[PDB]
């Protein structure tokens with residue numbers, strides 16, 4: 001119940017917290033000694049483009065793009081928690097929830113409600129759009145894994161990331177895209 | 193399928209993660225942001241900076257697409273001294289190459305988004321151009337703060353003098369310059 005107001009100063013401060021996403025490297029790459037790992041905002045950027053180009057006539061894509069730009073936003077405060085950090089699901093949720101409250105309080109009421117709603121939709125996976133964006137997250141991530149493998153000239157190195165997405169995919173377009181990716185990568189591995 | 197081309201499109205887009213923003217590099221910024229970092233916050237700005245006269249989702253899309261050619265041509269800075277037509281020519285070729293990897297409806301949609309920004313042919317594109325400049329001077333003051341070197345990136349602010357007229361962005365920029373100036377006066 002803070003007293004920072006909802007003027008330009010608070011909007012600016014909201015924007016600074018958001019910019020901290022540029023300086024949160026994605027932890028999974030850090031823990032695997034990737035040189036120059038992407039930021040969390042790098043990751044959401046490509047998810048957002050993927051929402052634009054991976055087709056599904058049943059989905060509101062404007063909402064999918066917004067879910068993509070908002071879903072990881074709490075990491076500007078809580079940091080990027082990876083499976084290796086062993087934070088229980090409930091504790092990660094509680095931290096990120098508190099963070100989103102703090103962040104959105106800087107915005108006028110209608111904007112606060114809208115952003116928080118989007119975050120809540122994603123976190124509870126309550127819509128088809130939310131579930132779609134969750135698979136973009138996982139897809140975009142193994143794509144980036146294979147790109148770090150290519151850049152390193154170390155085919156297969158980041159195998160653990162592929163294994164962790166086993167059976168997490170069921171959207172027919174993303175499923176198709178993943179299968180193509182795994183086939184191209186598993187070919188490169190055999191070549192080497 | 194489809195899929196191989198889509199993947200190639202995605203890998204090109206991914207290169208944006210590895211294009212440092214050139215203006216920061218030229219000013220010895222440590223670990224400078226990528227072009228995708230820059231577009232990310234611009235897209236968030238389109239969501240939270242008010243204007244009921246604008247199609248915000250179109251602004252968000254313009255934000256995510258406007259600098260996309262840079263995955264091929266790189267980030268050209270003013271210091272690079274590339275003529276406006278030449279940069280336009282290069283980015284246009286790049287967008288054609290990029291978008292042709294997509295199905296026809298998406299290829300046309302995406303190219304037209306980029307062209308609308310490029311030609312500044314809508315109220316939305318003009319708005320997004322001011323987010324770009326605003327996002328950038330905010331980022332300059334952030335680098336100044338992180339470096340503990342206030343005012344060091346003044347050239348960037350000087351470069352934006354008189355480029356703002358959108359009422360909300362103007363308020364935001366005034367607020368930023370007053371906070372920054374106060375910090376500089378203090379130090």
Ligand SMILES: [Cl-]
Nearest residue numbers: 043071072137
């Ligand atoms: Cl994520």
Ligand SMILES: [Cl-]
Nearest residue numbers: 230258259324
């Ligand atoms: Cl830009």
